[PDB]
Design a protein around this ligand. Structure first.
Ligand code: KDK
Ligand code: KDK
Ligand code: CL
Ligand code: CL
Ligand code: MG
Ligand code: MG
Lengths: 229, 10, 229, 10
């Protein structure tokens, strides 16, 4: 692609610059380019990838919801046309990310910390597709997300401690999937409570710095449980 | 839309 | 361009949607398309144009300043390359806006409220170029801004009351030009005080609603004077 | 950069 001629390390440097400048489309373009060099990513490099695309797709999702709500209220073609335009861009980004995970990040990820991170991302980007799906593939999209999340969960439960931030962020996300996408609110609540309680019981093993990382995500679980119960 | 907490940035 | 096949009114509708969605690049693209239909703009249409591009160029300026500061601190090529990339995009947007004003918004604007608005924009977008100019055209860029602003001022003083929000926003902007671009801080202060004091003396003539619009911009003049004196 | 007040949005 367009980043083919730039050095892997230069792309990573520039992703970090872009992040500081709040230039998240540039950030995502640079990390895409880094990924396409074909080497595995470090922990920090995985984080840069996720943050970039998360920021990009976040703007799209928020814009989609504004438009969709206006469209719902109105029920000429402009509102639907423009909502369709934003939706198609959002779908494009999700497709791009899924593309990177399938070609070939997931298949080369053997470590629990890499594998679970990528499979969570897979579940997330299918979840983003699900939020805007109304067609005959809606069910398959949902099952793709569920399947990605579950494989991640199984690995995380066998291979990581209950306080592992990756495992925690996966469970948070999978619980919201359950609540909101799968229409399984009891499953959502059950997962979020179990996850919180098992984390709680493992905190005693952590350094002050690990303690802060874990409890931050645990508080997110708590926030959702408060809304849900 | 009431959005629930999910991992990472907004 | 790409908006050639869409109806003028549909472009305006969609600019308004984009604004609500905080999709300012789309907003700007739609208003560019509206402009290129070749009809004059209404007051509301002028505002949509300005707000769109203002939002776009605002993100670029902020990102430029982050990068430029990092670059200044560092004194390999990546920091300068990436600052140059953002700068070139910023220059592109300014050039596009100046293009619209020259082809052919300004020459068809006869009303004080339209003419002054467009000439202020001209001064503003040359001012944005000036903020990032280091070359042998720096002086000409600055003079283009000065010239645009001054023509606007002359018209505003002859044709609008001292409380006219357009006139007020022009004087604010021209005062910052003086302070920061022309390195004329005494001129900046003098313009901002004179402008504030003449507005103050004309408020008695206004409705409650005009009063609120005028005093809001007057407070901006005050804010700068507080910083400057 | 200390940015001064100018017309319209940021
Ligand atoms: N550029 C970014 N936004 C991020 C970079 C990294 C990272 C930095 C060094 C090594 C590995 C990862 C992130 C993970 C966090 C998790 C919480 N504690 C420390 C950092 S996020
Ligand atoms: N879409 C936007 N952001 C804007 C639209 C308009 C406008 C709306 C109707 C007629 C003319 C102009 C703006 C000017 C303001 C000035 C202060 N009072 C009222 C509105 S701004
Ligand atoms: Cl559209
Ligand atoms: Cl670059
Ligand atoms: Mg129950
Ligand atoms: Mg003096």
């Amino acid at each position: 692609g367009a980043m083919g001629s730039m050095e892997r390390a230069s792309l990573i440097q520039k992703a970090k610059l872009a992040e500081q400048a709040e230039r998240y489309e540039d950030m995502a373009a640079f990390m895409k380019g880094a990924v396409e060099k074909g080497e595995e990513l470090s922990c920090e490099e995985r984080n840069l990838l996720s943050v970039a695309y998360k920021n990009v797709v976040g703007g799209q999702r928020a814009a989609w919801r504004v438009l969709s709500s206006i469209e719902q209220k109105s029920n000429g073609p402009e509102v639907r046309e423009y909502r369709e335009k934003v939706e198609t861009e959002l779908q494009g980004v999700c497709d791009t990310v899924l593309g990177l995970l399938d070609s070939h990040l997931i298949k080369e990820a053997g470590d629990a910390e890499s594998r679970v991170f990528y499979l969570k991302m897979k579940g997330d980007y299918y979840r983003y597709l699900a939020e805007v799906a109304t067609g005959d593939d809606k069910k398959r999209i949902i099952d793709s997300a569920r399947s990605a999340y579950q494989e991640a969960m199984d690995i995380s439960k066998k291979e990581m401690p209950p306080t592992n931030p990756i495992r925690l962020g996966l469970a948070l996300n999978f619980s919201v999937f359950h609540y909101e996408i799968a229409n399984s609110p009891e499953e959502a609540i059950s997962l979020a409570k179990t996850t919180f309680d098992e984390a709680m019981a493992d905190l005693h093993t952590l350094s002050e710095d690990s303690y802060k990382d874990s409890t931050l995500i645990m508080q997110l679980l708590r926030d959702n449980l408060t809304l849900w119960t | 839309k009431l959005m629930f907490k999910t991992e990472g940035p907004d």
